[PDB]
Design a protein around this nucleic acid. Structure first.
Ligand SMILES: Nc1nc2c(ncn2[C@H]2C[C@H](O)[C@@H](COP(=O)(O)OP(=O)(O)OP(=O)(O)O)O2)c(=O)[nH]1
Length: 174
DNA sequence: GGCGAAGCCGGGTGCGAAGCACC
């Protein structure tokens, strides 16, 4: 497996050096539009897979990062994942790892963070628990009888206090 | 089976044969 320092280093590398294609040209990606996801946030001592969160604030460029996102001078294979997820194979130091990224709207950030930070069952439990509150909670926002309702916050306690739930630490397992 | 507002159970797509399998 990999190590925290390496994860942090690659995270730093990705945090200070990413890049993406743009209408035939290329644009670099730095820290403010990038967040980390993985064992580090869950606090694991064994790094299986280290992920990241990359959201776009612009409504158009949101889909401009989607085209071709990459780094300068490395081994990487990027394919589509799931529905609209990004599956990357990364090779460096003669080593290849599997990175599953996701790029979404900056407003999805809290929900995204919440969804991405803990466990599916909690997510579903939370989803149903919340749905049963007569509201459907998805990356996009809150859906009500096919109606769409967006978020008003940008933070975690904010999101929990926004929906009306408590923040449970992964280590407690739901 | 377990549940905070009553009756409920994520969201979808890349394929391979429209049905299964991952994030
Ligand atoms: N694999 C998987 N990921 C899901 C699911 N639902 C939501 N996600 C999220 C979790 C992450 O935000 C992203 C998947 O990342 P990974 O495959 O690396 O797993 P995750 O990061 O949750 O665990 P980790 O801390 O990296 O070992 O999609 C699901 O059902 N399966």
């Amino acid at each position: 497996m990999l190590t925290l320092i390496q994860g942090k280093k690659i995270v730093n590398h990705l945090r200070s050096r990413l890049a993406f294609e743009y209408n035939g040209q290329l644009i670099k990606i730095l820290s403010k539009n990038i967040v980390a996801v993985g064992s580090l946030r869950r606090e694991e001592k064994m790094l299986n897979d280290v992920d990241l969160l990359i959201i776009v604030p612009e409504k158009k460029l949101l889909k401009h990062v989607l085209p071709n996102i990459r780094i300068k001078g490395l081994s990487f294979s990027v394919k589509v994942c799931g529905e609209r997820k990004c599956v990357l194979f990364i090779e460096w130091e003669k080593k290849t790892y599997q990175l599953d990224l996701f790029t979404a709207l900056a407003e999805e950030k809290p929900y995204a963070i919440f969804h991405f930070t803990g466990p599916v069952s909690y997510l579903i439990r939370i989803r149903a628990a919340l749905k049963k509150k007569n509201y459907k909670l998805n990356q996009y926002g809150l859906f009500k009888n096919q109606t769409l309702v967006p978020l008003k916050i940008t933070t975690e306690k904010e999101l929990i206090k926004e929906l009306g739930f408590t923040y449970r630490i992964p280590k407690k397992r739901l």
